[PDB]
Amino acid sequence: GKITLYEDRGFQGRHYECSSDHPNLQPYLSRCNSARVDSGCWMLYEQPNYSGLQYFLHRGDYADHQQWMGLSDSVRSCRLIPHSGSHRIRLYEREDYRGQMIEFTEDCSCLQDRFRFNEIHSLNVLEGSWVLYELSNYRGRQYLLMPGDYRRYQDWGATNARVGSLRRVIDFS
Length: 173
What we know:
Layout: E1 2-8, E2 12-18, E3 34-39, E4 41-47, E5 51-57, E6 60-62, E7 77-81, E8 88-94, E9 98-104, E10 122-127, E11 130-135, E12 139-145, E13 148-150, E14 165-168
Antiparallel strand pairs: 1-2, 1-3, 3-6, 4-5, 4-7, 8-9, 8-10, 10-13, 11-12, 11-14
């Protein structure tokens, strides 16, 4: 994958290119107001070491941080999200894989049309990477999910269990 991050909007100003995870962009990039993703899928983070607010970017041209729903021009680390050639996830009503479970292999724009709960308390990412969204239609706080176990909502970086939609991490090209 390849991404170029720019200090000013419209692909202007000082910039920095990444082709792998970068845990601390601060020396190389003082702010981020636009990005061009040439390939791969990326998660931008407000704080170093993959912490703070998260934002999913795929291939394309993002002329303003608002296009990735960025709440500010602070981008201080980024992950190259591993490609996968399938997706499967189990979402659970309660912590520790308890209660009702609903399984997905495709995107879901409104979890509540499939599952009566406003919250998911644990999940198992069996195949591929996903972005979990606080709100329906891929809005609100974003949480990158990579293959592995998540016994509690705090394991995906959330401060509560609210979930509204779920998206596979896929490069269309």
